Amino acid sequence: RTSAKSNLMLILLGLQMKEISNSDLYKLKEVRSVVTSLASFLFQQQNVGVMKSFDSLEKEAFRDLVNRLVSQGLIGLKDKTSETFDLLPLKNLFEYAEKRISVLMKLQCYTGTVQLSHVQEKLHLPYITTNGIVDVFKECLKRTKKQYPEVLKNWWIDLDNSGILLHLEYAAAYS
Numbered sequence: 677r678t679s680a681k682s683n684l685m686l687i688l689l690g691l692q693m694k695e696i697s698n699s700d701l702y703k704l705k706e707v708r709s710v711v712t713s714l715a716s717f718l719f720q721q722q723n724v725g726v727m728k729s730f731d732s733l734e735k736e737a738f739r740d741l742v743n744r745l746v747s748q749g750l751i752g753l754k755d756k757t758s759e760t761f762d763l764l765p766l767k768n769l770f771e772y773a774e775k776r777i778s779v780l781m782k783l784q785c786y787t788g789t790v791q792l793s794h795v796q797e798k799l800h801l802p803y804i805t806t807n808g809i810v811d812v813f814k815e816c817l818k819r820t821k822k823q824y825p826e827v828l829k830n831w832w833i834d835l836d837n838s839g840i841l842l843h844l845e846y847a848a849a850y851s
Contacts, residue, residue, distance in 0.1 A: 748808030
C-alpha cells in the first residue's frame, strides 16, 4: 500500500517534536521495523562475492531512507555536525496539502492544479520536488477519503515538474 520511504515519512510526521537526531530516530521501534525490512532486501541485492553483516545492511538501509526524504525536500538536515533533522518542512507540507484539499472539496472542484513553485514560495522550501509533493498529497487524500466517505468518493493525481493535477470525484451524499 505504501513504500518504505513513505512509511518512514509517516512516522516522522507523527513525532511530537520539531527536530530529531539521526541516532534518536534510529532507536524508534517503528523505524527499526522499516529498516529491518529494507535491509533484508539489500541482503538479497548484494553482488556475488559481497556479504556484509546484517547490521551493516540495516545502517545502510536507514541512510538510504533518510537520504531519499532529504533528497525530495521532505525533511532537512538542520545541523550536519550533530546530524539533526528538521521535521518542520514535512509537517508544514502536510498542513498545506490538508488545507488545499479541504478548500477544493468545499468548492466541489473536480480538477485543480498545484504548482511546485507556489508551494516552494509559500513555505520557503526551495528543495521540495514534485515527487515529494505527490507523496504528501497521496497520503492526505488517502486519509481524507477514510475520514469523509460521504464527500470524497475517489481521487487521482496527474503530473503536469512544474506541478501536479488533482482529480477529485464526489460521493452521492455530498452530491
